[PDB]
From a paper:
While unrelated in sequence, OGE is structurally homologous to, and shows effectively the same Mn2+ active site as, the C-glycoside deglycosylating enzyme (CGE) from a human intestinal bacterium implicated in β-elimination of 3-keto C-β-d-glucosides. We show that CGE catalyzes β-elimination of 3-keto O- and C-β-d-glucosides while OGE is specific for the O-glycoside substrate.
A single AtOGE dimer is present in the asymmetric unit. Each subunit adopts a TIM barrel fold, comprised of eight centrally arranged β-strands and seven exterior α-helices. A 14-residue loop (Thr198−Gly211) between β-strand β7 and α-helix α7 as well as the C-terminal region (Leu236−Gln259) show low electron density and are only partially modeled. Despite the high similarity between the two chains in overall structure (root-mean-square deviation (RMSD): 0.221 Å), only one AtOGE subunit (β) adopts the metal on the position that is plausible for the substrate access. In the subunit β,it is coordinated by residues contributed from β-strands β5 (His132), β6 (Asp163), β7 (His189) as well as by a water molecule. Glu233 from β8 is weakly coordinating.
Numbering used by the authors:
A (entry chain A): 1 to 199, 213 to 238
B (entry chain B): 5 to 42, 46 to 197, 212 to 235
Amino acid sequence: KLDDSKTLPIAAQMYTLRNAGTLEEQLAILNRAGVSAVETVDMQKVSASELNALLEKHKIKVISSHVPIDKLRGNLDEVITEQKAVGNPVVTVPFLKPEDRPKDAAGWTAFGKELGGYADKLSAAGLSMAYHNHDFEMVKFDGKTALELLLDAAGPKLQSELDVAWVARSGNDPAEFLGTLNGRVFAIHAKDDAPAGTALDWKTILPAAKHAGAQWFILEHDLPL
Amino acid sequence: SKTLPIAAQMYTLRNAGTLEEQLAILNRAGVSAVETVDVSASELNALLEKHKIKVISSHVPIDKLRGNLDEVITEQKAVGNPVVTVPFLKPEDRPKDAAGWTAFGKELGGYADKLSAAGLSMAYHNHDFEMVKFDGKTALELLLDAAGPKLQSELDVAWVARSGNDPAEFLGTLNGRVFAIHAKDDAPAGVLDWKTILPAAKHAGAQWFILEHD
Ligand SMILES: [Mn+2]
Ligand SMILES: [Mn+2]
Ligand SMILES: [Mn+2]
């Protein structure tokens, strides 16, 4: 079970709701599962002060938050204000819609350089930055993945939220990929199929992750299709 | 091993809140099971199977158990619910002395025997009024002991502790007679010593941790 692993501390991906009453049930589940940290999605749906009061009550910490690229492009100052309203989360690029995906190696380089500029401004405001990949960043140009192109061009203020299932599915070894990102990994992300309860060669991946500097194993439960 | 699976007790729809939003929250929290409360079996089987969530318990009021039990059996089997749970007693239905709590346990034990012959199990969910004591014994122990082991406890540990009884120790008196632990979601993170409650619950044979939305 991924939740019973103890190489990396566990964090849960949590979808925020407008109703702070129903948000409390999600936090009570984490308390009983022994999970103390969350990565938030849609955090702006709820009032910051209401969410802060509930997190404090349940001793849960927001360790990162999904911020779409159009918000980083359109008003970064507002992103900074919104994220700091709840504390100190890593600002994480969650996904790229098809229309935002570069087409060639030079485009992926330019995109990483763009993100590196945001990472500098976020850093000046006291916020870190991460990038969460899926499958389209695994495309390769002359032997190098789009993901490595953009992270290398962005510089070490941008860390990887590495989705290792997509790394492996593309035919790259996840542990070796983590070696190339030594000191530039924020977390490992994985889908969790195990039912909630009280409390891919993971046996090599999680040690490689920890040696690279990963701080969190972020687990996600999905809606069925 | 040392984990209790978590189920959620469903709640009524207030404001705009839909039922499917309830199930979607549970999917995203990873909760695989629900305890239902008081819409047709056709409608709720369909939504539960589409969200891949099973019913593990259903709150059935005492007046239904007393009035039409064969109908209770039919309705529970229609949604695949395996456990009939008495959720509450209104003040007028609460026995007044030790003899009355014993007689009430015997009554419930008769329903548990009939439910068992129909292939269904039975549990009893307490609040605070069952924690009253007669010559050292709680009303809750009187009724469970008198009902026999076909009636199990859905033990509300907050009300046990609030009455001055250690919930871990109380679970020890109910070894093999505990269906679930019950708790609400509005409690601050550490009143209740979950470091002792959870192993006691597991040792006693609890099958579920059931979370109630205040
Ligand atoms: Mn992410
Ligand atoms: Mn490189
Ligand atoms: Mn209860």
